[PDB]
Write a protein that binds this ligand. Structure first.
Ligand code: NI
Length: 462
């Protein structure tokens, strides 16, 4: 991805948003009971902790575009993923606005608590004003869709979340790039059925884990990805995507039967205008973070990329032997033989992709079921029933996170949530976690859930 220009909002005529004021994250009543080294991300320019220039840290994610136009390696990839999709019989037809907004059994309703984007947030119009689940009215949406039309700027602001000290010093906060309600509705209308099938089918046909529930999906993963695993990390995947990938996405949507109208939506994703604060700017390449189908399209795109890398890098590689699931940038794969990911990573840099070994690793080593990471989590066979895999959220992460809160009344649920994650790590870990919690009179007053109750519940899902 690459910014093409920047200009003042007076010139472009775009409305401006309020800068978020303070972080909403406070010290929790466990702030110093547990250890970690994370604080609220830098949320503005004058943050006393900044060792560098903010705005140029913000936008350095956009490392250029290396290629605008699919070569043969990419076209063949796209087509193989497209042919693979064929068997899911994706409904290529437009979804009703009602469903688009209000959801069906496999597409969640538009989230009423998120911002409505441009120009809604600048005018103080909230989704709640336009959308009511109790009536499923779409007449108001039609009205605003007429009023402001389509293909609007992405309203961009800083994500209020926890970051390492390293990222706070180095100004590496993350951006939220929210598409306008108008464009979310329209994208969902054009691709809602695709979203539905993808939610209903996490696995190796879609090649997508979006919407999976790791509680159960983890047990399928060994079966779905047999033979020899592989996995790595990308640095700033989203922003490093050059247009070529949007082009390749188009080939895939064409080949599975989409109309040209629906396909033209993609250019409005590959080429976006954003409004960060007082300026508006043009990005060409890069998946916006907050675009309706971000997750899926990123996941689809990654399906294209892994295949392209494979067949550009190795000869006689048979793509039907591949298995992968992708959740945005995050991929878990297998193949019947080992795969030299160092060479993949090199091929990757040619395309503008930065690939590093799995889990901050020193080296492109072995990934097996024991060290493998997916959606932050590791894989641990249940001791009694080894066919059941537990998703292991590192405790390090659970510790970091319990030390802060955005709502001071939520301690109870905040701890319970963390417990629902921590127990997958084993009885002895869990006890260690709960005992630290219970190490402080406030801990002791909480209803903390029982290890063997959590486990009996977990079994009852299989
Ligand atoms: Ni532009």
């Amino acid at each position: 991805g690459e910014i093409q220009w920047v200009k003042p909002n007076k010139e472009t005529g775009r409305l401006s948003i309020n800068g978020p004021t303070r972080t909403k994250l406070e010290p929790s009543v466990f702030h110093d009971v547990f250890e970690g080294n994370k604080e609220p991300a830098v949320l503005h320019s004058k943050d006393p902790r900044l060792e560098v220039d903010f705005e140029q840290a913000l936008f350095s994610k956009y490392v250029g575009n290396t290629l605008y136009e699919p070569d043969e390696y990419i076209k063949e990839a796209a087509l193989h993923y497209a042919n693979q999709l064929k068997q899911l019989e994706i409904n290529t037809s437009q979804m009703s606005m009602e469903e688009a907004c209000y959801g069906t059994e496999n597409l969640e309703a538009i989230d009423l608590h998120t911002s409505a984007g441009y120009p809604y947030s600048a005018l103080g119009i909230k989704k709640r004003d336009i959308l009511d689940p109790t009536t499923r009215d779409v007449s108001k949406m039609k009205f605003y869709m007429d009023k402001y039309g389509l293909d609007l700027p992405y309203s961009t602001y800083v994500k209020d979340e926890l970051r390492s000290i390293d990222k706070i010093k180095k100004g590496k906060s993350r951006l939220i790039e929210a598409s306008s309600l108008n464009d979310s509705v329209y994208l969902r209308m054009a691709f809602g059925h695709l979203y539905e099938t993808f939610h209903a089918n996490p696995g190796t046909i879609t090649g997508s884990a979006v919407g999976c529930n790791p509680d159960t999906f983890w047990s399928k993963l060994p079966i779905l990805l047999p033979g020899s695993l592989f996995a790595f990390d990308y640095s700033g995947y989203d922003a490093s995507l050059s247009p070529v990938w949007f082009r390749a996405l188009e080939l895939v949507l064409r080949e599975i039967g989409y109309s040209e109208g629906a396909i033209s939506l993609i250019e409005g994703i590959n080429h976006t205008h954003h409004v960060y604060r007082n300026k508006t700017y043009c990005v060409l390449g890069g998946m916006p973070s907050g675009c309706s189908g971000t997750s899926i399209f990123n996941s689809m795109i990654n399906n294209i990329i892994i295949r392209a890398l494979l067949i550009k890098t190795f000869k006689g590689i048979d793509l039907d032997e591949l298995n992968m699931v992708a959740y945005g940038d995050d991929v878990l794969a297998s193949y019947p033989f080992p795969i030299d990911c160092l060479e993949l990573a090199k091929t990757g840099k040619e395309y503008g992709l930065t690939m590093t070994p799995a889990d901050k690793s020193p080296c492109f080593n072995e990934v097996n079921w024991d060290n493998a990471t997916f959606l932050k989590r590791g894989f641990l066979p249940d001791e009694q029933f080894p066919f059941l895999i537990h998703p292991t959220m590192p405790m390090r992460e659970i510790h970091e996170s319990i030390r802060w809160t955005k709502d001071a009344r939520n301690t109870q649920d905040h701890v319970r949530s963390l417990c629902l994650l921590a127990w997958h790590n084993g009885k002895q870990e869990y006890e260690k976690f709960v005992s630290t919690i219970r190490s402080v009179p406030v801990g002791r007053a909480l209803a903390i859930p029982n290890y063997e109750n959590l486990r009996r519940n977990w079994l009852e899902l299989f």
